[PDB]
Design a protein around this ligand. Structure first.
Ligand SMILES: CC(=O)N[C@H]1[C@@H](OP(=O)(O)O)O[C@H](CO)[C@@H](O)[C@@H]1O[C@H](C)C(=O)O
Length: 216
């Protein structure tokens, strides 16, 4: 299937790095964060990728271009207003079309093997969950994801989404989580618990951890 990489974040918590460099282009062990995803996606057999952007967006396009160096075809979804994760995905849906797509949070660094998500999957959404880095986000019972409360897990920012998840939505800014929680209540969200390496690189301290973990 196709993949979307979320890359529109302003990365205020990573200043001053993100003053002239958008977060997805920040180097982790010599390589831009987002290029780990592109190489892994290409290795997993993905050939078409959509990348949304806002803050310093044109630098992302200039650096990556059409993606041919990665064996990929990249299309961009520019945002001129903050749309959040849900609104950003919605704006990009015409580029993704009607079929389920892989969704990856650009800020994440992870070992996770994207080719795993090509296996037969469950629901309007299939979420990869990780140990809390914390009250967590969600709970996993067997393969079914439910809302968190008391052994909770954290959403990794890695998932497969069905465009139908967004049926009825209106253009504009809105968050993804509330939509997932609405699908969970309908029993349409499956998931899995990944126990390997995963870091949400939102701060210089997270950058370091990723650096350290990549040292193995
Ligand atoms: C959309 C998404 O990937 N949300 C995840 C992302 O959020 P981020 O830190 O990038 O803002 O990483 C967090 C863990 O660090 C999760 O709790 C987030 O999922 C929760 C459900 C959320 O969106 O509120």
């Amino acid at each position: 299937m196709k993949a979307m990489i979320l890359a529109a974040g302003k990365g205020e918590r990573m200043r001053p790095l993100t003053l002239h460099t958008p977060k997805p282009l920040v180097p982790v062990a010599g390589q831009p964060l987002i290029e780990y995803h592109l190489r892994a996606l290409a290795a997993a057999g993905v050939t078409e990728v959509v990348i949304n952007h806002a803050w310093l967006g044109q630098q992302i396009e200039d650096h990556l271009g059409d993606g041919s160096r990665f064996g990929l075809s990249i299309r961009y979804s520019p945002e001129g207003e903050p749309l959040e994760t849900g609104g950003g995905i919605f704006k990009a849906l015409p580029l993704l079309g009607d079929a389920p797509f892989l969704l990856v949070n650009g800020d994440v660094w992870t070992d996770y093997d994207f080719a795993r998500l090509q296996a037969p999957l469950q629901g309007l959404a299939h979420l990869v969950l990780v140990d809390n880095p914390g009250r967590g986000d969600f709970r996993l019972v067997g393969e079914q994801v439910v809302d968190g409360d008391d052994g909770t897990l954290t959403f990794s920012g890695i998932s497969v989404l069905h465009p139908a998840l967004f049926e009825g939505c209106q253009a504009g800014a809105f968050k993804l989580a509330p939509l997932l929680r609405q699908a969970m209540a309908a029993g349409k969200v499956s998931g899995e618990h990944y126990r390997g390496h995963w870091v949400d690189v939102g701060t210089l301290e997270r950058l370091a951890e990723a650096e350290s973990l990549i040292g193995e």
